[PDB]
Amino acid sequence: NNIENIGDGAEVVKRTEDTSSDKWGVTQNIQFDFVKDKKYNKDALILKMQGFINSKTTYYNYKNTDHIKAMRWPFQYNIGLKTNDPNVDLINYLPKNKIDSVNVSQTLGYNIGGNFNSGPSTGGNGSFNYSKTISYNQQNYISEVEHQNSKSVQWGIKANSFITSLGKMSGHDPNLFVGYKPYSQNPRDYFVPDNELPPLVHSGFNPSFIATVSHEKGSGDTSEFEITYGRNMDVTHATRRTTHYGNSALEGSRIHNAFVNRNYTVKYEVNWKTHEIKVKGHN
């Protein structure tokens, strides 16, 4: 339906899937680009994983106590791709290396014969028959590949370094996001305002990741892929201790990994012969 000629007898067959979950607060917008090149001895599929993961940050009374309030927030965003097809191999993924740049912008370039290049989106690596670019912001967060093998890749985009009213804080600091004194008994009012929170905490994350897989020609028409987007959430408790003597400022405590793997997983079936992509299921 949507095919691009990429020169020298090759073409790219493009398909996009877009699926949202109100339950998980996730949109997976996936681009599936089949590279049809007679000069490359395997079938190739480039996946560009975009969409949005809501932060799902919430505020509540800890055990409905009078003076302990809680903030549930995304310590890490999860992006993962996996297959169970023995005929498929993961051949590249971007970003490949740990990266803390506020903006991550990279390009995967393809040249006839199964040649792939990873480099800056600004170029300087050469001319390609086809290319795909990723771009995402991750202010105060850091991206890393948590694991990768021939069948899967998982990234974590985690809370890293913050500028607070008390100076620099790591993503593990128990006082992170805790206010000075409550403005009211509303649980929100024990934590700093939205302007003092990064977009990844107040709003969410706009992923932009690439993975390329190869498939043995003539080995089977279909493969299943599971793509997972989600969050691992931490809880910060802020406690107001009344004293006529010391510091009555709020004190923070952290429950690290309070609600892990809150993920939306979608199973996609890829047909290497027809180029039909279909959703097989989801949670």
Residue numbers in the entry: 2 to 284
Manuscript excerpt for this entry:
The mutants exhibiting significantly decreased binding abilities with respect to wild-type LukS-PV were: R73A, Y184A, T244A, H245A, and Y250A, with Ki values ranging from 1.8 to 6.2 nM, i.e. a 69- to 238-fold increase compared to the Ki value of wild-type LukS-PV. Four LukS-PV mutants (R73A, Y184A, T244A, and Y250) displayed significant alterations for all measured parameters, i.e. at least 50-fold decrease in affinity for hPMN membranes, 2-fold decrease in the slope of Ca2+ influx and 2- to 10-fold reduction in pore-forming capacity. The Y250A mutant crystallized in 5% PEG 6000, 0.1 M sodium citrate, pH 4.0. Crystals were orthorhombic, space group P21212, with cell parameters a = 85.30 Å, b = 84.29 Å and c = 38.09 Å and 1 molecule per asymmetric unit. Crystals diffracted up to 1.55 Å. In the case of the rim domain, wild-type LukS-PV and mutants T244A, Y246A and N248A displayed only small differences, with r.m.s. deviations comprised between 0.20 Å and 0.30 Å, whereas the structure of the rim domain of the Y184A and Y250A mutants were markedly different, with r.m.s. deviations of 1.10 Å and 1.28 Å, respectively, when compared to the wild-type LukS-PV structure. Of particular note, the rim region was generally associated with weak electron density, and could not be completely built in most structures, except in the case of the Y250A mutant. In the Y250A mutant structure, the removal of the tyrosine side chain allowed the displacement of the N248 side chain, which in turn drove the reorganization of residues R241–Y250. Space was therefore provided for the displacement of the V179–Q186 loop, which adopted a conformation close to that observed in the case of the Y184A mutant. For both Y184A and Y250A mutants, crystallization was achieved in different conditions than those for wild-type LukS-PV and the other mutants, resulting in a different crystal packing.
